[PDB]
Design a protein around this ligand. Structure first.
Ligand code: NAD
Ligand code: NAD
Ligand code: NAD
Ligand code: NAD
Ligand code: FBP
Ligand code: FBP
Lengths: 316, 316, 316, 316
């Protein structure tokens, strides 16, 4: 129901990421009901109108309306996009003090609501803030999901889809670790088809080679390059979130590189970090523990350590 | 062709209306090729990147990129969403001399591209600018479509879908004439299902009555209300642009309330104005001359009386 | 859930009508789980299989299987496309005896399954069996829905769209009453947009009149010409089915002309017949009482009369 | 254009597969114009109307009709589905002389249209009949595509997707060689994510081992479990055909395992067979030569060895 008995998705923090997220769902026709909750009520309000006015044309009927935390109680997924945005220069981590703060309230209000579905966090630092969402709430880590490396993984696929002129969609590779600076390309297990990548290049020596490194860097700095170009990013994320949201509402068991919490799986513990996980109706079915090279073993590990410390000194 | 062979939609003015628009094409999966052209290349470039990052998740494989007017030589439709934005407070039509000027260039360049597809105009005041576009392009008018009243109707429908509690989609009423303050709601020909509106409300005077004029006023007011709440309308128009587009791209013979040129049809000539028209792969097949009551017969000629002014005066 | 948590549709009779309707849900990505119960094992098996091998190409993850009646406890929809079909020569009603027999067990076998969702019937004669299905089910009549004249209406707009060269989707006309030879065209409430049909032809020559008239005959007789060419009809109906399926599963508030039960609504009572009705997540919200003309009230009434007699003469 | 201006696909042989295909495309929203040509018009006249009756509820406007060869002159794509179906006990190869004979005409007749698009061959033996169309068409072999191992592959991924409990859309494996008995699963290069199959099963040796070979057999034999349960297969092959069709029509640069010409690539020349290949607006871009263990190579050669004997004797 669009009228309380359907797929109700609640968006907390309706700015660029937020609202784009909503426009993608509407266009895509993914949820039944969509609630917008934002501090800037007005924003929540015009936006809502704005969506409803174009609805005569969406592919599927959906119920959009501006709400409150009580709308939570009944929603299936609480997607969080409120908070501070990295300005030019700043990293992801320069926000932790800022956001964790906001999360204490947000998360408290939705729990108080009587809520009980899953949580989809998108705010940066996505690995820091999903752990906190997991904490501040007390639900199983299995129902607190962060975008993680879904935006980064898709950029990879895009760039490599372009290098070899094949559908991104037929490009098989991941970026894991912190959705940020310590992220890493899992070259060791990257494929174009079923044909490994680090083997179609072995024929074009120290070109393929430099070329490949080049992509990764573009990958890794995407945000900064786009932040610099138009101030904030959000279409890349909107699609990423819209994609995760259907694995769930459609109980898909789609492998997705998202922010999963580990406790020994990658030889790391008590950290939320981007890793392959099977997503379904009930949140994370399980984290996939892919075979890494010593090289990867090492930077993944370097990344896990990085987050680790932030958490260390960053709780509440 | 994703590579110089299919539906090439070229967007000029990658600001809000523009990009939101491109966003919809992308999720609905409507064009094969999408090119962006904005005076502000930076903008246009972080948008093309931001777009592309999400497409491994897009419904349909699309080709988005930042181009230039030569990318027009090959396009089926060029949508204009560039130009100056009416600001808060109260200013629509005050965007004329302003916009006329900008049109003067864009057209030239595009026409210079060696373009021969359709123009889709969205800048304000949409009707004025449609004329200009047509004038400056010198393509037959049946190939210069304006968005005119396509948003104002989505809204009547939505508002009445709601009063009446039916899919907006089952609400059949129109808004024509100026896409601005002289617009009029065609009550004489407004249905719910196949049942006259003023007959459904028949039974409940100066109640349902007053509720009918209250809906319409919020129709007319819509932009000024959103603009004050979130500063600029853009999701509703994008869903709007998106619709027409499929009319064209799919040889649909859809009936939309667009900006069409008159030559005697509503007792008016030399005026691009909002009026139901059969759209299809070759532009407007014809203007549909509904019948109006004396009253609506009056507002219409009135609205038209108004636009003709502006043109009389801000052409030359 | 493809996994016991989604929208589940049980299909009883995987014949032409049955299986084609399943093929629709799947290419449209409409339900999460699709159960097929056919009195013919192999077949039901043959198809679940054949369905399955293609879904990798399906637009939406969908779980399809060959089930049984326990399957019905958790389904949201039970669609019945089982039993005997008219032969060249036969009419809808010659099937009554043959088929009421089959709904007793089926209707029983599901009610005992612990079933508590909505029924959508399509076996012919579609209005006798919608009545039989509500009775034998002892559910509120608003939860037992028959396809009725959805297909009839569909061929009208198709045809009317073609004559006037407008999108099927732009012709607004109904085919009410019986889903057989007594059905009638509400020519009094038909529009091409907001333009009364009998007023576009009001201008014409070589009987737009005659032509209009000829359409309906074509509508009326369509099964018969189609049966005579390819042996049975199933694609039209597969599309009406999936349409309703949508109104329901999406809590849509869609006005459809389905086989609904009247309790004094068209001056008729205790009968299942084609009439416009708002459809949503809880069965039928209400029957719409369009205003008929004297000729139409007349044929409506004679249609209802033909039905009651069979109800009256062939109850189980 | 729904009106001589878009992507026109022609279906020669509106049988089970021919017709299902059209059902796949219409629901999915892929062509603009679909022409049906059958030895037996009636069949064709029957489907056409059946189809048209339901189009008011198709997602996108499409135009169906029963035409003829001239409708091929303007055709983007000519999909051949006409000819004799393998009977139970009968092999793919007992059909050859039957089906060659028919292709000489059909082929010759479309050419003569002034046909100049691409050919997608479905009729069995697919590798043999695709070669035949190329032979008979005199067009460059990049324009004569057979469906070869696309279903065989739709099948392997669905079965493993189940064995492992991941979305089939997430199993990366192929079936190559003759669409028939000599086909082979490319085990040496199959993943479930980014992780090697014979690595996941590594841990439960000779259980995972046996499981995996059953699957394979189920795949190999699937044609016949179905021929025997329900008499003809047509739902998988139709989703498979729909998929190619979009690869082309969207100039997607997709990698599918199709029947393609070998001119050295797997150390085989002058044979048409199931091999991965990039597909776009111009048909086949290239054959993809993946890496094979000795075993795969051997069978693959062996398979080739077989097509090659049939052809030697099969010319017309
Ligand atoms: N993880 C990803 O891949 C990713 C990608 C892009 C952007 N982002 C994240 O998105 C976040 C902000 O995104 P943005 O650019 O859309 O910013 P934005 O300003 O557009 O949106 C933030 C919104 O949150 C609302 N908000 C603030 N405090 C609130 C509170 N206490 N309760 C409810 N709502 C509140 C504000 O009203 C504002 O509208 C950043 O943290 C950024 O890191 C994440
Ligand atoms: N037609 C409708 O119903 C409707 C609805 C809403 C808004 N609008 C109209 O949309 C128009 C623009 O919309 P917006 O709010 O997104 O404004 P915006 O400022 O955000 O975007 C307009 C863009 O045009 C660009 N531009 C200006 N001159 C250009 C040129 N010569 N070449 C290329 N790019 C150029 C600017 O850089 C800017 O990016 C306004 O004129 C507004 O009135 C129309
Ligand atoms: N309502 C409409 O517009 C409409 C349109 C077209 C056709 N039809 C109706 O659909 C009905 C059948 O259509 P069809 O062409 O698919 O017939 P069909 O023979 O091809 O299919 C009927 C199926 O029912 C199965 N069946 C028989 N007894 C059963 C039982 N007890 N439980 C489960 N399955 C059982 C058969 O084995 C077969 O699979 C006919 O009444 C026909 O009049 C209705
Ligand atoms: N490649 C695949 O994976 C695949 C899968 C399944 C079935 N099939 C192939 O499909 C073929 C037939 O399929 P079906 O089950 O739908 O058969 P069918 O008998 O239902 O359809 C075949 C059609 O061919 C028509 N036809 C015959 N000669 C013709 C001619 N000269 N010109 C035009 N039309 C002509 C017939 O009248 C009939 O309409 C078989 O040969 C089989 O090998 C292929
Ligand atoms: O590359 P293949 O094996 O042909 O498979 C393509 C399928 O894989 C996907 O790209 C998913 O890939 P990932 O496993 O990398 O998530 C789908 O989008 C697509 O349908
Ligand atoms: O003629 P209009 O007002 O543009 O109406 C089109 C709308 O009507 C519909 O065709 C439904 O029509 P009905 O009201 O006749 O059921 C929708 O599918 C479509 O969005």
């Amino acid at each position: 129901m669009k009228n309380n008995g359907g797929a109700r998705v609640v968006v907390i923090g309706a700015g660029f990421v937020g609202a784009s997220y909503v426009f993608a769902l509407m266009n895509q026709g993914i949820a039944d009901e969509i609630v917008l909750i934002d501090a800037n009520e007005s924003k929540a309000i015009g936006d809502a109108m704005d969506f409803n006015h174009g609805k005569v044309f969406a592919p599927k009927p959906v119920d959009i309306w501006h709400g409150d935390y009580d709308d939570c109680r009944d929603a299936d997924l609480v997607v969080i996009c409120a908070g501070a945005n990295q300005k030019p220069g700043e990293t992801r981590l320069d926000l932790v003090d800022k956001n964790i703060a906001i999360f204490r309230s947000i998360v408290e209000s939705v729990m108080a609501s009587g809520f009980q579905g899953l949580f989809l966090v998108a705010t940066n630092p996505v690995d820091i803030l999903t752990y906190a969402t997991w904490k501040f709430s007390g639900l199983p880590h299995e129902r607190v999901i962060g975008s993680g490396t879904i935006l980064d993984t898709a950029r990879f696929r895009f760039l490599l889809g372009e290098y070899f002129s094949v559908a991104p969609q037929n490009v098989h590779a991941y970026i894991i670790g912190e959705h940020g600076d310590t992220e890493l390309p899992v070259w060791s297990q990257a494929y174009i088809g079923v044909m490994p990548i680090r083997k179609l290049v072995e024929s074009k020596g120290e070109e393929a080679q430099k070329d490949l490194e080049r992509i990764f860097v573009n990958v890794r700095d995407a945000a900064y390059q786009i932040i610099e170009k138009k101030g904030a990013t959000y279409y890349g994320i909107a699609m990423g979130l819209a994609r995760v949201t259907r694995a769930i509402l459609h109980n898909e068991n789609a492998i997705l590189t998202v922010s999963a919490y580990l406790d020994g799986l990658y030889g790391e513990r008590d950290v939320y970090i981007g890793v392959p996980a099977v997503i379904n109706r009930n949140g994370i079915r399980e984290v996939i523990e892919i075979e890494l090279n010593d090289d990867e073993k090492n930077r993944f590990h370097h990344s896990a350590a990085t987050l680790k410390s932030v958490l260390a000194r960053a709780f509440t």
